[PDB]
Structures are given as structure tokens and as C-alpha cells.
């Protein structure tokens, strides 16, 4: 009954794209530092995830749009939306999460399908099946590079608990994350730097709460606002983190912004 959103951002301005799944359609709102506008993306789906990477100043976006029978990959490479090579069978209610790293890029896409999360990987030549296989109905992911080594954190929410699964190049292990919440989580994650710093937002029965990692234990963050559905993106300006959280209750999406000095309501509108 609430819309479902996905967001990505790039550069220091920043540029942002926010995708909203509402009543079977995914549409796009865009920011390049000078007002929100409606982007061209318009495709069927009940669930959306997104990742993006830069090649110099040129943005590349990958949108994973799930209907009741298929996930389709939609590619923006500066010159129109084109269907990509990624495909997966689904059933109604399936959820995805996507990350990418480098400029090749590498991509990992996680799908929660009938209570199981599985992983598909792009290495620059083809898609292959990843080792990840854990229970979950909802999923979010974030990733960070330490030199050339990718680190991945996946937040797997079953009916009862949210577990963090960590890839460090050698195998998947359970992470320190605890939700500080009861059963029924939907999550969104972002990360920055190489420690890393992680922020995980949980929507649970209409409330969003924040859990925080800066390298030395998980703690409850200042962010606390209503929402049935959450997404997030973040960007660095030198050493300073900026965060944009997209909180939705029904068809109303409110942006909340961290710029170093508390949460403020952002200029985002759905229009």
C-alpha cells in the first residue's frame, strides 16, 4: 500500500536520481543541484533497485525493475535507456538490491525470492552466480573498496530478524549489526570511506530508525521519522558526509537531508 523507492547519487554537487514504484509503474525524479525534475525513465515494476558509477564525468545507471515474473535491467549510458543483459525469473513480491564498484564496473545484484536471497555478479564480460545464499524477504546492500579489495555488507531481513552478511574477499561471515527493532523490517544502507562508516535505515510498522557504524560498534542514530518505506544515498564533499533519506508513507515521499548539522527536510517532491 506504500510506494517503494530507490536512489543513487554521484559527484559532489551532487546529482541524484530517485526511482519510485507505485501501482505497477517505476518513474524517476532527478536533481543536479538546481531543482527537482521528472526524468525520462518510465517502466513497469513492483520493486526497483539502482546502482551507478562514473567513467570520468559520465554517469552510468543500472535500474533493476521487477514485475511478477521477471527482473529487467535498464541501462543509462548518457544517451537513452536500453534493456541490459541481466535477467532473472521472479514471483510476485520479489525484492532486489544492487551495488557496484570501480569503473569496469563490477556489479552485484541480490534478489529475495520466496524467502531466499541469492546473488548475481558482473565482472565486465558476463553475469555469473555468486556464492551468497541466505534467508530473507527484504534486502539492502552497500559496498566499499579497501585498495583494490571489495568489501560488501548485505542486510537480510526475514520475518523475525535482520542479519548483516559481510564479504571480505575470502568468504561470507555474519556481521556485528543488530537492528534495535522487533519483527518486520525493510532496510536501506549506505556507506562511505574505507573504515567504513555505515548507516542502515529500517522501516518497521510505519517508523524509520537509524543504526550507525563508524568502525567501533553499532549505535542508534539521530534519524527518526515516520515511513513505511525507506531508501538512501550519500556523497562525500572532501571529508564531510551528506545523506539523503527518502521516507514514504502511502504515496507521500519526504526527503530528509544530513549536511553535518542535524536532519532537515529536503526540497524533494514527487510531482
Ligand X SMILES: CCN(CC)c1ccc2c(c1)Oc1cc(N(CC)CC)ccc1C2c1ccccc1C(=O)OCCOCCOCCn1cc(CO[C@@H]2O[C@@H](C)[C@@H](O)[C@@H](O)[C@@H]2O)nn1
Nearer to ligand X, 75 or 270 (CB): 75
Answer yes or no whether residue 241 interacts with ligand X by CB under 6 A: yes
Contacting range for ligand X; rule: CB under 6 A; set: 33-41, 84-92, 109-117, 129-137? 84-92
Helix ranges, the chain (H): none
185 annotated binding-site participant: no
Q: What is the distance in angstroms between the CA of the first residue and the CA of the last residue of the chain?
A: 19
Contact set for ligand X, span 187-206 (CB under 6 A): 199
| Distance from C-alpha of 105 to C-alpha of 128, rounded to nearest angstrom | 14
77 makes contact with ligand X (CB under 6 A): yes
Q: Does residue number 56 form part of the binding site for ligand X (CB under 6 A)?
A: no
Per DSSP, the chain holds a count of helices (H) and strands (E) of 0, 24
The CB-of-227 to ligand X minimum distance in angstroms stands at 15
Residue 264 burial (CB count, 10 A): 11
Q: Is 258 exposed, middle or buried (0-12, 13-18, 19+ CB in 10 A)?
A: buried
* Cβ 77 to ligand X shortest distance, Å: 5
Q: Which is nearer to ligand X, 3 or 26 (CB)?
A: 26
Q: Binding ligand X by CB under 6 A: which of 176, 239, 260, 271?
A: 260
The response to whether 123 counts as a known ligand-binding position is no
Work out the angle at residue 136's Cα, subtended by the Cα atoms of residues 67 and 132, and round it to the nearest 5 degrees.
95
Q: Determine if 211 is a binding residue for ligand X (CB under 6 A).
A: no
User: Sign of the C-alpha dihedral, residues 116, 122, 123, 127?
Assistant: positive
Query: Partners of 247 in the beta sheet?
Result: 230, 254
Cα→Cα distances 53→77, 103, 200, 201, 241, Å: 10, 6, 21, 23, 18
Residues placed in the known binding site for Mg(2+):
7, 98, 189
Detail the residues annotated as belonging to a binding site.
Answer: 1, 7, 46, 60, 98, 137, 151, 189, 228, 242
* Binding residues for ligand X (CB under 6 A): 62, 73, 75, 77, 82, 84-86, 122, 125, 199, 210, 212, 214, 221-223, 241, 258, 260-262
* Annotation: binding site for Zn(2+): 1, 46, 60, 137, 151, 228, 242
Amino acid at each position: 500500500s506504500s510506494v517503494q523507492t530507490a536512489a543513487t547519487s554521484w559527484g559532489t554537487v551532487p546529482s541524484i536520481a530517485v526511482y519510485t514504484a507505485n501501482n505497477g509503474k517505476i518513474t524517476e525524479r532527478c536533481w543536479d543541484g538546481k531543482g527537482w525534475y521528472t526524468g525520462a525513465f518510465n517502466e513497469p515494476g513492483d520493486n526497483v533497485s539502482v546502482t551507478s558509477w562514473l567513467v570520468g564525468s559520465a554517469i552510468h545507471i543500472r535500474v533493476y525493475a521487477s514485475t511478477g515474473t521477471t527482473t529487467t535491467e535498464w541501462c543509462w549510458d548518457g544517451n537513452g535507456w536500453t534493456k541490459g543483459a541481466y535477467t532473472s525469473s521472479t514471483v510476485p513480491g520479489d525484492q532486489t538490491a544492487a551495488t557496484s564498484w570501480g569503473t569496469v564496473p563490477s556489479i552485484a545484484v541480490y534478489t529475495a525470492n520466496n524467502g531466499k536471497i541469492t546473488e548475481r555478479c558482473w565482472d565486465g564480460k558476463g553475469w555469473y552466480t555468486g556464492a551468497f545464499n541466505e534467508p530473507g524477504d527484504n534486502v539492502s546492500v552497500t559496498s566499499w573498496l579497501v585498495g583494490s579489495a571489495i568489501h560488501i555488507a548485505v542486510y537480510a531481513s526475514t520475518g523475525t530478524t535482520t542479519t548483516e552478511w559481510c564479504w571480505d574477499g575470502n568468504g561470507w561471515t555474519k556481521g556485528a549489526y543488530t537492528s534495535s527493532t522487533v519483527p518486520g523490517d525493510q532496510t536501506a544502507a549506505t556507506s562511505w570511506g574505507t573504515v567504513p562508516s555505515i548507516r542502515v535505515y529500517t522501516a518497521n510498522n510505519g517508523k524509520i530508525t537509524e543504526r550507525c557504524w563508524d568502525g567501533k560498534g553499532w549505535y542508534t542514530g539521530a534519524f527518526n521519522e515516520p515511513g513505511d518505506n525507506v531508501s538512501v544515498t550519500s556523497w562525500l564533499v572532501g571529508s564531510a558526509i551528506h545523506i539523503a533519506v527518502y521516507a514514504s508513507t502511502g504515496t507521500t515521499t519526504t526527503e530528509w537531508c544530513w549536511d553535518g548539522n542535524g536532519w532537515t527536510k529536503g526540497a524533494y517532491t514527487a510531482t
